[PDB]
Amino acid sequence: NEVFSRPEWMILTCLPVPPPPVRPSISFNESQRGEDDLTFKLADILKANISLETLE
Amino acid sequence: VLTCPECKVYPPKIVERFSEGDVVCALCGLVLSDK
């Protein structure tokens, strides 16, 4: 489809980041925040992206 | 900050009802925040 479903869009260029509601942090205490798996994966994605950029 | 809009007493007196998921003023019985 021309409006909604072009094929060029099937290849990623920018990755949306979901709000913290989607990846809620569980806080046992004031300084004890266990983060969700999704945010760890996103952090690794960004780390790899900046490494590739600085090597580029 | 969470205050009763009818007692207007500072500092506010507040009790949390965990088994009902409510926050209740301990003077007028008014329910402040739910869930």
Place this chain on the structure above:
Amino acid sequence: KKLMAQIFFGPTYYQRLRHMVDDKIHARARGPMQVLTRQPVEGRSRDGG
């Protein structure tokens, strides 16, 4: 009065099992929710739905 039919009668052996009604009874009007899905929690000891 007397009973028309006679009755089988005598001692036996019985065991009191592990299931009491006091450990199975549960009710809930409102209460705590979940952090992610915001739906009533699971568990009788945690007064869930």
Place this chain on the structure above:
Amino acid sequence: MVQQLSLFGSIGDDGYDLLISTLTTISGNPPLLYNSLCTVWKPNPSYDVENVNSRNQLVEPNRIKLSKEVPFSYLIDETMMDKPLNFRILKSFTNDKIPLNYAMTRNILWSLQISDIPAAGNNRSVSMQTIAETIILSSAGKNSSVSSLMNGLGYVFEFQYLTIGVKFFMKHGLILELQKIWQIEEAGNSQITSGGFLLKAYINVSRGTDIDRINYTETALMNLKKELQGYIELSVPDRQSMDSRVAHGNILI
């Protein structure tokens, strides 16, 4: 026990006379003199009432009012028998001094009365208050006295005051009162309503469940207030001022 629906206001004594005439022009009735004496009693602090259910707040301590009528022969000094007993005598009652002193009231020692803070919410146009009332007729025994009785219940004296004013009876059971209040102590007598008269218009409802009657009462009170527009402003007092519980201390005067 009644639901009293009330509106309040105040006036300066300068217009007093004029005001009176206008009232007679509306009601069609003449004013009637009256007086009273109220004593306030509070629970004894020496006794620890652990029975107040702190975890549930089933009840909170409150203050009891005992009222009595006192003859004018105690309120008229040697300069005033010449004038007849009518409303004009109030024009001479502008000084903080009064014939009735502390010793006479102590020698005196009825209607017993308890009340609650008015109903909450901001959608109320008149002050609605709940009153529980009883009457003491007489007594006997080796210590028959109001003080001994209230100490037997568990209450002690706190203060007292004297009201003098006039009453107007209008239709539908509406009562309008013009008052002057004198607080009394051994130190002396002080007029709190200094240089003015306190105005209070109210109706009583016997049953709180009946709502047609309550709506009619509110209609009558608001019509009366809308009649007096431009002369006197009748207003709903502060809900936190008419609270008489022991924990928090303030007194609408």
